[PDB]
Amino acid sequence: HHHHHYQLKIEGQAPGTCGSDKSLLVSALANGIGLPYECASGGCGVCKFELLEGTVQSMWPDAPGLSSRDREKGNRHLACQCIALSDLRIKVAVQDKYIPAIPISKMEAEVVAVRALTHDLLSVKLRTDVPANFLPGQFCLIEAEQLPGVVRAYSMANSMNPDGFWEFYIKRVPTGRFSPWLFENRKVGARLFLTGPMGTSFFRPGTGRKSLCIGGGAGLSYAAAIARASIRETDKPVKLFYGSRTPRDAVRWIDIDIDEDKLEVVQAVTFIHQVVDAALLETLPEYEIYLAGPPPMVDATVRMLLGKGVPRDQIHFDAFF
Ligand SMILES: Cc1cc2nc3c(=O)[nH]c(=O)nc-3n(C[C@H](O)[C@H](O)[C@H](O)COP(=O)(O)OP(=O)(O)OC[C@H]3O[C@@H](n4cnc5c(N)ncnc54)[C@H](O)[C@@H]3O)c2cc1C
Ligand code: FES
Ligand SMILES: [Cl-]
Ligand SMILES: [Cl-]
Ligand SMILES: [Cl-]
Numbered sequence: 001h002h003h004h005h006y007q008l009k010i011e012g013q014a015p016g017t018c019g020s021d022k023s024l025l026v027s028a029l030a031n032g033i034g035l036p037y038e039c040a041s042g043g044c045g046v047c048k049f050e051l052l053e054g055t056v057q058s059m060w061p062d063a064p065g066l067s068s069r070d071r072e073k074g075n076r077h078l079a080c081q082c083i084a085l086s087d088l089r090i091k092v093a094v095q096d097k098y099i100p101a102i103p104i105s106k107m108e109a110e111v112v113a114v115r116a117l118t119h120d121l122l123s124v125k126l127r128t129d130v131p132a133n134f135l136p137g138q139f140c141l142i143e144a145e146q147l148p149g150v151v152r153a154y155s156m157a158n159s160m161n162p163d164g165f166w167e168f169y170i171k172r173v174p175t176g177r178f179s180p181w182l183f184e185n186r187k188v189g190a191r192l193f194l195t196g197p198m199g200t201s202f203f204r205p206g207t208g209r210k211s212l213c214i215g216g217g218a219g220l221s222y223a224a225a226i227a228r229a230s231i232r233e234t235d236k237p238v239k240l241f242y243g244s245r246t247p248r249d250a251v252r253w254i255d256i257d258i259d260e261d262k263l264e265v266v267q268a269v270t271f272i273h274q275v276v277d278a279a280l281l282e283t284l285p286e287y288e289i290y291l292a293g294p295p296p297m298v299d300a301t302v303r304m305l306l307g308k309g310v311p312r313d314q315i316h317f318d319a320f321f
């Protein structure tokens with residue numbers, strides 16, 4: 001239904017516009033403003049900003065993204081958790097690196113293909129009208145009309161293509177809202193809204209370096225997409241690890257669809273981030289490394305890698321908040 005458009009005055013920057021049913025973050029990114037973000041889901045806190053003038057409705061007040069140091073300030077909010085209720089004056093430190101490489105849009109999608117990788121995991125491929133332009137390792141915020149007020153980040157598994165396909169592996173979380181849906185009450189022909197492409201943890205080409213991919217749990221999508229781009233780039237030895245709790249979170253490679261021969265998997269079946277240190281030892285620093293999965297598994301791998309020589313700028317990751 002209807003949307004209102006308000007003025008988004010952002011200090012030090014050109015007057016943009018925000019919306020009444022769009023996060024402030026996706027409003028700014030639509031304007032091409034490199035407003036800091038990571039999860040876009042209320043966890044990282046990277047999208048924090050102060051309110052100089054105006055009002056906002058928070059999608060989720062309890063959001064642990066902002067430290068109570070920011071919360072004690074009182075006028076600080078998460079850009080990924082706010083909608084504009086009026087004209088707004090905000091102060092955020094913006095950075096070019098966040099500027100979208102490919103212009104983000106909200107688009108209409110139709111479920112075209114479903115595949116059960118495991119009982120825990122399900123691949124859904126959706127068709128948009130427009131081409132599916134996105135960088136390897138990026139994500140979309142995916143909404144569903146029947147479920148109002150629940151947007152959820154999901155990493156692209158497939159690669160950018162002219163015929164407008166978007167594929168996601170989603171893991172079933174009982175106790176969740178969105179996951180017990182595609183896993184229960186949805187099928188081919190179901191209608192979904194895709195907001196993207198989002199993410200700054202995408203594949204970097206032309207570094208002239210080895211490429212290591214480590215994906216935990218549902219972080220297979222991100223890890224696959226990177227690895228399946230790494231071999232397209234050079235076909236030099238490209239490494240991909242997978243993390244699962246039980247050896248029965250079925251591991252398949254034709255189901256995950258690469259050069260089976262030119263990609264050596266080291267699926268770890270429990271914590272992954274120890275075998276990676278085991279096999280590669282001190283080879284790490286010469287790799288560009290890419291990381292995805294639940295926050296505890298991801299937030300732990302970053303220090304084991306950082307403490308073992310690897311420069312900060314050589315590591316890339318999306319934590320599944
Ligand atoms: C960058 C990124 C990429 C991701 N990629 C993938 C992927 O490829 N595959 C995959 O399976 N999962 C991915 N996730 C996690 C994905 O959101 C899961 O589906 C998550 O478990 C949500 O499922 P749910 O809504 O059923 O669970 P819920 O338990 O309903 O929601 C859990 C998450 O939703 C958010 N949340 C909590 N409360 C609220 C609220 N009141 N309003 C709005 N949001 C709330 C929080 O981020 C929380 O961690 C990703 C997350 C991020 C941040
Ligand atoms: S980007 Fe808003 S908290 Fe992660
Ligand atoms: Cl201002
Ligand atoms: Cl949004
Ligand atoms: Cl907030």
Ligand SMILES: [Cl-]
Nearest residue numbers: 030104105106
């Ligand atoms: Cl948009």
Ligand code: NI
Nearest residue numbers: 002003004020
């Ligand atoms: Ni109205």
